[PDB]
Structure 1
Amino acid sequence: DNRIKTVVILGGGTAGWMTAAYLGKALQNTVKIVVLEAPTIPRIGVGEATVPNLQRAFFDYLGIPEEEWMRECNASYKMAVKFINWRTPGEGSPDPRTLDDGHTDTFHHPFGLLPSADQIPLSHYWAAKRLQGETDENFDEACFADTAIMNAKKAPRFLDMRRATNYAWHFDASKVAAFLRNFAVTKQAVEHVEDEMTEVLTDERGFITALRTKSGRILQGDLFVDCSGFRGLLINKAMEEPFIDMSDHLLCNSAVATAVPHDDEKNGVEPYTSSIAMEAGWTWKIPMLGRFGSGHVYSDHFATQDEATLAFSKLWGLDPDNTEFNHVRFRVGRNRRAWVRNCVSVGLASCFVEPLESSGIYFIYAAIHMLAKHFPDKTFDKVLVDRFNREIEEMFDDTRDFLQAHYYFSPRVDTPFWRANKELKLADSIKDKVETYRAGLPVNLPVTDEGTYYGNFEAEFRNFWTNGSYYCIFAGLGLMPRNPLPALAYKPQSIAEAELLFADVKRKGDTLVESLPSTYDLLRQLHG
């Protein structure tokens, strides 16, 4: 019997308890699972956003109904991230400015896959009309019925819970962690050790054999998961694996955040996350029931902590001297290798980007999903470890490049921060994708229906940022192809076929805006 017998997870939070809960199910109680979590003072919940696969790939895998965990974490609904004022110059404001053509400086990044006509996505039929002056609708409103629903703040489900569109979730991360802790301990025989780690003991081959606790207890294990956050107490300190700083791709490195009370009955609840551009970064708005979390992501090379806190306070009209703020300084990049010997890093201990596109929880699940697939025995095959590392670094580098495109193609040049983003270098892969986009060709064309895409995680993992997403960001920022897809000039029947698709997007949005309940009303029914 050369199997792993004990897995020790260092650190709690979402990363530690998602790992414990998932491995408890995946290893079918053949392995003892221990979580060593230092007790900490509970901070205010600033909000976390997710992607649609979380319910199908994670909670359904654990047998946890969607409504059950939503009620224990004050969860809300998310249909997109909404970018505000990323093209017009000026101070930070929650109200969108006006573009040169009179349109409001907002664009959406919704979920789902675009329909096709003659194997060509709807985005390309829109671009042909837009480039020729035959339409004045923006991409998101022409190709997504979700845009009309979000503008009316309607819910993604009816009152009888029939689905209307794809959606993800907003929640308090600390309440989700507490929920999974109770689940894993009572229903999955996970042992919770409330103590601090003081020393990491390694053998002659450099493998971790045990952790010492502050109380003197020794925790022996065979496989160790580092969920200790940015400190990387196992992967970086003990294993000495270098962290690859990637600040030459993304300049932001700091954040100030808080939670703001919100009158839901008066103003309603927005079924989306807002990305509000600032002078030295941007500010998120993650609405929940009764309050929304908000945080200003900024670069300390272009704004001091006080400057960022004042601009953040002025955004929501807060008293900086009588408001509870949280200040964070984070590292941007990834470890050279996520898995070294018998130490697997998950979450912030592995890699991190600014939450511009809700990568945090997704990065955690994708790692624990790949860990179960590549789970070793006590021999720790180098090929298993290498293939795991390969999937993690490709996943991260791909999303990193996607985020850099947000800053590089923003037309703003009014402050040194926005000017400095144009001096950074694009990765070769994102340069290649832009070149393809500018020719009128699709980028990362979806090959599956939405059922396969969101029902099988491996299908989405091989194509996370699809053609629709690149059009949302590129066209949203004003970057258009040089010309329409040249094949469309020979396909008049296909162009007419897509006109029916455009009419369906208008028809679906208008019908649903009438019949769907408000997000506020669905939340009251859910949390009632």
Structure 2
Amino acid sequence: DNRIKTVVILGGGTAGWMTAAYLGKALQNTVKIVVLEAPIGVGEATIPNLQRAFFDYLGIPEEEWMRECNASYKMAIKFINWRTPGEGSPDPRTLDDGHTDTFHHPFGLLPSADQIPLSHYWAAKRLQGETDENFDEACFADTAIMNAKKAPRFLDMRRATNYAWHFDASKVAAFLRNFAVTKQAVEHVEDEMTEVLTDERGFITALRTKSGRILQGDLFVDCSGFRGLLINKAMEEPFIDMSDHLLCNSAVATAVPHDDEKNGVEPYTSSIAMEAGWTWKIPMLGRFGSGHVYSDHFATQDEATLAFSKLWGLDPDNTEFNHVRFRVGRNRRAWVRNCVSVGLASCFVEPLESTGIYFIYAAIHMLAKHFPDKTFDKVLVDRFNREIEEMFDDTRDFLQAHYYFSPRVDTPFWRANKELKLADSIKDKVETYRAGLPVNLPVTDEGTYYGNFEAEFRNFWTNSNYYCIFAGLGLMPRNPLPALAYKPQSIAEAELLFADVKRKGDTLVESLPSTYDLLRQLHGA
């Protein structure tokens, strides 16, 4: 009998309790699970597969967890002032053509005509001077719905659009801890780790605690955060610093009480460009989480905190600030011997595409797939490690493109981004885009894509996502897709799709409830 009998998780929070609850379901009461954890809600934003890939697996209905963590609805990230110079403002500046400096990255699907995405018909007309319309307004009904602050469901809870979630991550962690301890008999040891015991092979045998426990385990999950107390400190696995691709390394954050009555609730996360980074806005009922992500090479903590405060008119003497220094990059290997890293202990990028929670449940999914026995088959470990490195580096490259293709040159920070190098993989995608070709076509429709883990994991950033960011920032193809010059019938079919987007936006803006009204009903306010 070579089975793992005990799994010890170091750390709580979202990483530790997502790991505990998921393995609690996956291992069907065959394995003892222990969490060792020493005893302000700035908001977290997510992507649409969180319910299908995580909560549905645990059998937790969406409304149940949402009501425990002041959750709200997200249809997109809205990028504000990424193309125009100046100080941080929550209000969009005006471009040369009179448009507000805003662009959306929605979760809505792009339809195709003749197997060519609607993006490419839009780009052909834009390049040929035949449309004045922005990509997001042309191609997604979601853009109209967001502009109206309408909800992605009706009051009868019928779905209207794709969406994900805003929530208090501390409340999600507390909710999952309660679930794991009360419904899955996970053992919660509330104590400080004082020593990692290892054998002659460098495998972890046990964690010593301050109170004198020696917690034996066969498999150790490092959820200890940026310090990597098992994977980095005990296992001596090097961390690969990737600040040569992304310069931001710090955040200052708070939660801001909000006049939902007067302002409604935006069904999207905002990414507000700053002089030395950007600021999130993550609406929830009664308040929005907000954090200024910055490079401490280009702003001091005090300078960033002052800029963040000025943005929202905060009184710095009645505001609780939370300050973090990030580690940006990933370990050389996520799993070494009998130590698997998950969450910040494994890897991190700034929350610019709301990938943090996704990286936790993707890692947990890959651990359950590659779950070992005590022989620690090197092929299982290697395949898990390859999946984590590919997932991470692909998202790192995608985030670098947000900065690299910004036209801003107004501050040392915005210029400094354009002196960095792109990795070969994203250079290849930019060249493909610049020739008018799609980048990573989607393989399926919405249901299959957000309802099968492998489908989204293998095609995570697709053509729609590349167009939203490249075209949003003003990077266009050199010329239209040449095939379109031969396809007058397909161009006509695409005109019907553009008209469908307009009619659907008109219809749903008229018929949907406000996000505020859907939230008041969900939370029983």
With normalisation by structure 2, the TM-score equals: 0.99
Q: Secondary structure at the match of 2:281?
A: strand
Indicate the SS of the match to 2:288. strand
Q: Deviations over 1:4-51 (max 9, x none)?
A: 00000000000000000000101111111000111xxxxx10000000
Q: Deviations over 1:305-326 (max 9, x none)?
A: 1111111110001122331111
Partner of 2:497: 501
Partner Cα distance (1:469, 1:123) in 2: 11
Report the more deviating stretch, 243-252 or 320-329: 320-329
* Separation in structure 2 between the aligned mates of residue 362 and residue 285 of structure 1, nearest angstrom: 19
1:112 CA drift (Å) = 3.2
Which residues of 2 match residues 156-167 of structure 1 at below 5 A?
A: 156-167=152-163
1:267-311 CA-to-partner distances (Å, cap 9, x unmatched) read 100000000000000000000011001000000111111111111
User: 231-240 or 444-453, which moves further after superposition?
Assistant: 444-453
Alpha-carbon deviation of 1:213? Answer: 0.7
Separation of aligned partners in 2, 1:190 and 1:355: 30
- TM alignment of 1:41-440, pairs within 5 A: 44-440=40-436
Q: Is the 8 A contact 1:139 1:472 kept in 2?
A: yes
In the TM superposition, what is the alpha-carbon distance from 1:450 to its structure 2 partner?
1.0
- Deviation per residue, 1:341-391 (Å, 9 max, x gap): 000000000000000001100000000000000000000000000000000
Whole-Å separation in 2 of the counterparts to 1:79 and 1:131: 28
Check conservation: 2:335, 2:341, Cα contact below 8 A: yes
Describe the SS at the equivalent of 1:489. Answer: helix
> Residues of 2 paired with 1:485 and 1:46: CA distance?
43
Structure 1, unmatched stretches of 5+, are 39-43
SS in 2 for 1:33: strand
For 1:125-165, what per-residue CA distance to the aligned partner results, in whole angstroms no more than 9, with x for missing partners?
00011111111111001110000000000000000000000
Is the CA contact 1:24–1:190 (under 8 Å) kept in the aligned structure 2?
yes
How far 1:218 moved relative to its partner?
1.1
Query: Distance between the aligned counterparts of 1:320 and 1:444, measured in 2?
Result: 46
Cα distance in 2 for residues equivalent to 1:312 and 1:398? 30
The answer to whether structure 1 residue 29 and structure 2 residue 29 are counterparts is yes
| Percent sequence identity over aligned pairs | 99
Secondary structure, in 3 states, of the residue corresponding to 1:417? helix
Return the alpha-carbon distance in structure 2 between the equivalents of residues 354 and 454 of structure 1: 23
Partner SS for 1:295: strand
**Partner Cα distance (1:19, 1:157) in 2:** 30
In the alignment, the residues of structure 2 paired with residue 253 and residue 434 of structure 1 have an alpha-carbon distance, to the nearest angstrom, of 26
1:237 is displaced (CA, Å) by 0.3
CA contact (8 A) 1:208 1:224 kept: yes
CA–CA separation in structure 1 for the residues paired with 2:501 and 2:318: 47
SS at match of 2:422: coil
CA distance in 2, matches of 1:51, 1:130: 29
Residue 5 of structure 2 aligns with which residue? 5
Does residue 454 of structure 1 match 2:450?
yes
Deviation at 1:63, TM superposition (A): 0.2
Alignment deviations for residues 171-225 of structure 1 (CA, whole Å, 9 cap, x no partner): 0000000000111111111111111101000001000000011101110000000
2:23 partner SS: helix
Q: Is the 8 A contact 1:9 1:20 kept in 2?
A: yes
Once residues 210 and 514 of structure 2 are traced to their aligned partners in structure 1, the CA distance between those partners, rounded to angstroms, is: 51
Superposition deviation, residue 167 in structure 1: 0.2
**d(CA) in 2 for partners of 1:326, 1:63:** 34
Rounded Cα–Cα distance in structure 1 between residues aligned with 2:250 and 2:2: 45
- The CA distance in 1 between the partners of 2:457 and 2:250, in whole Å, is 29
1:473 equivalent in structure 2: 469
- 1:485 positional shift: 0.3
SS at match of 1:525: helix
Contact 1:113 1:446 survives alignment (8 Å): no
SS in 1 for 2:418: helix
Alignment check: 8 A CA contact 2:12 2:35 kept: yes
Q: How many residues align?
A: 523
Inter-partner Cα distance in structure 1 for 2:51 and 2:133:
33
> 2: CA distance between counterparts of 1:355 and 1:480?
25
1:244-286 CA-partner distances (Å, limit 9, x unpaired): 0000000000110011000111110000000000000000000
Question: In the aligned structure 2, how far is the partner of 1:372 from the partner of 1:481?
Answer: 41
Cα shift at 1:496:
0.2
CA contact (8 A) 2:108 2:162 kept: yes
Structure 1 distance, partners of 2:263, 2:373, is: 55
- Match of 1:92, SS state, is coil
RMSD: 0.5
Look up the SS of the partner of 2:352 in the other structure: helix
Query: 2 CA distance for matches of 1:421 and 1:260?
Result: 30
Deviation, 1:447, is 1.6
Counterpart contact for 1:8–1:221, Cα < 8 Å? yes
The runs of at least 4 consecutive aligned structure 1 residues that moved more than 2 Å come to: none
SS of residue in 1 equivalent to 2:8: strand
| Partners of 2:108 and 2:142 within 8 A in 1 | no
After superposition, what is the alpha-carbon deviation per residue over 1:45-95, rounded to whole angstroms, capped at 9, x for unaligned? 000000000000100000000000000010000000000000000000000
How many angstroms apart in 2 are the aligned matches of 1:519 and 1:195? 42
8 Å contact 2:248–2:295 — kept in the other structure?
A: yes
Per-residue CA deviations over 1:368-423 (Å, capped at 9, x if unaligned) read 00000000000000000000000000000000000000000000000000000110
Judge conservation of contact 2:367–2:384 (CA < 8 Å) in 1: yes
Separation (CA, whole Å) in 1 of partners of 2:219 and 2:346: 16
Q: Answer yes or no: is the 8 Å Cα contact 2:330–2:346 preserved in 1.
A: yes
What is the rounded CA distance, in whole Å, between the counterparts of 2:63 and 2:173 in structure 1? 16
Q: Secondary structure at the match of 2:425?
A: helix
Q: Secondary structure at the match of 1:271?
A: coil
Q: Distance in 2 between matches of 1:314 and 1:163?
A: 38
8 Å contact kept, 1:52–1:454: yes
The normalised TM-score by structure 1 is 0.99
Q: Distance in 2 between matches of 1:92 and 1:451?
A: 38
**In 2, distance between residues paired with 1:66 and 1:278?**
34
Report the CA distance between 1:113 and its aligned residue: 2.4
Query: How far off its partner does 1:230 sit?
Result: 0.3
Q: 1:84, 1:96 within 8 Å by CA — same for their partners in 2? A: yes
Structure 1 residue 526 displacement after superposition = 0.3
